[PDB]
Amino acid sequence: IEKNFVISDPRLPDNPIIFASDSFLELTEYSREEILGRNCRFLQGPETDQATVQKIRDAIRDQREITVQLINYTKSGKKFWNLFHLQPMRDQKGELQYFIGVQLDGSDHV
Numbered sequence: 001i002e003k004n005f006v007i008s009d010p011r012l013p014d015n016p017i018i019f020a021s022d023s024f025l026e027l028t029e030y031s032r033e034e035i036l037g038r039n040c041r042f043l044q045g046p047e048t049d050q051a052t053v054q055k056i057r058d059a060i061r062d063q064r065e066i067t068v069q070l071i072n073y074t075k076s077g078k079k080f081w082n083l084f085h086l087q088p089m090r091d092q093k094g095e096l097q098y099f100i101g102v103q104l105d106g107s108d109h110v
């Protein structure tokens with residue numbers, strides 16, 4: 001159904017990643033041990049558009065899905081366009097439980 005994704009737990013301090021797919025590890029160049037328990041903002045850097053970061057922050061605040069594009073960086077500092085989709089995940093009682101974040105490398109590396 002999906003390839004690059006992480007799951008965060010917003011009920012833990014600073015909404016840490018608690019699950020990452022094998023593909024996300026490949027995309028970002030980080031190991032599972034290097035990722036788990038951190039907020040995904042570590043992928044950001046100098047050319048990340050702060051207006052877009054604000055949009056994601058607001059979408060998380062409002063618990064709404066969003067589909068944006070933003071500059072991210074791999075472990076080794078390789079800049080890429082992240083085509084990013086956020087989706088809140090609620091339990092049957094309607095209470096927020098997780099966020100799923102889906103990433104795609106929107107850059108051509110010919």
Ligand SMILES: Cc1cc2nc3c(=O)[nH]c(=O)nc-3n(C[C@H](O)[C@H](O)[C@H](O)COP(=O)(O)O)c2cc1C
Nearest residue numbers: 006008039040041043044053056057099100101103
């Ligand atoms: C599940 C999930 C996945 C996320 N994935 C990314 C990502 O791949 N790249 C990125 O720049 N930010 C990602 N974020 C956004 C940051 O974690 C953070 O919410 C954003 O930078 C805005 O909050 P801040 O202003 O406190 O940094 C993700 C957030 C969540 C909840």
